[PDB]
Structures are given as C-alpha cells and as structure tokens.
C-alpha cells in the first residue's frame, strides 16, 4: 500500500467556485457566474443564464452551493 492522494483536480474545479465568491462566503448569484466567466467573454446570453439560475434554484432560496459549478461540470445527463 503506497498512498493515493485526492486534492489536485478537487482544488482545480473548487478553486474556480472560489473565483465565483468575490467577498469569500461559499454561495452565489447571477452576476458572479457572468463576471468571472465575463473575463473570457462567454458564448451564452444573459437571458439563457437567467433561465439557468431559475432552473437550479427551483424553490427560490437565494444563492447556490459548491454542488452547482462542481455537480453540473462532473455529471453529464445523456438526453
């Protein structure tokens, strides 16, 4: 038994969820998605990205967790 580390890919996709949180708190709104994705440019419009915030926060609490940038990036649902 050598020792398998779990830390490099986990700190890559969670480090990007830390680019969401400008004041450092662990949950976000519409503009954080668009803002750091805005540095690139982004293929989607602001109407398509407002439909996305309504899809995943269905009930309407306020702000999203580690599981939305992490959980939609990992699992791809086939049709």
């Amino acid at each position: 038994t050598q020792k398998m580390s779990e830390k490099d890919t986990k700190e890559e996709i969670l480090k990007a969820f830390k680019l969401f949180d400008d004041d450092e708190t662990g949950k976000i709104s519409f503009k954080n998605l668009k803002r750091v994705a805005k540095e690139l440019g982004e293929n989607l419009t602001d109407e398509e990205l407002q439909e996305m915030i309504d899809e995943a926060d269905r009930d309407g609490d306020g702000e999203v967790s580690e599981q939305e940038f992490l959980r939609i990036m990992k699992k791809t649902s086939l049709y």
Partner: peptide, 17 residues
Amino acid sequence: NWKLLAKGLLIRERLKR
C-alpha cells in the same frame, strides 16, 4: 445551459492559444 457555462467558468487557470 449550466454545462456550457461550467466549461466557460472551468477557465480557472487560463485558456491557451
């Protein structure tokens, strides 16, 4: 789509060429 915006914000390090 949150999958298209997840690659778009997977940008975390850089891009390339």
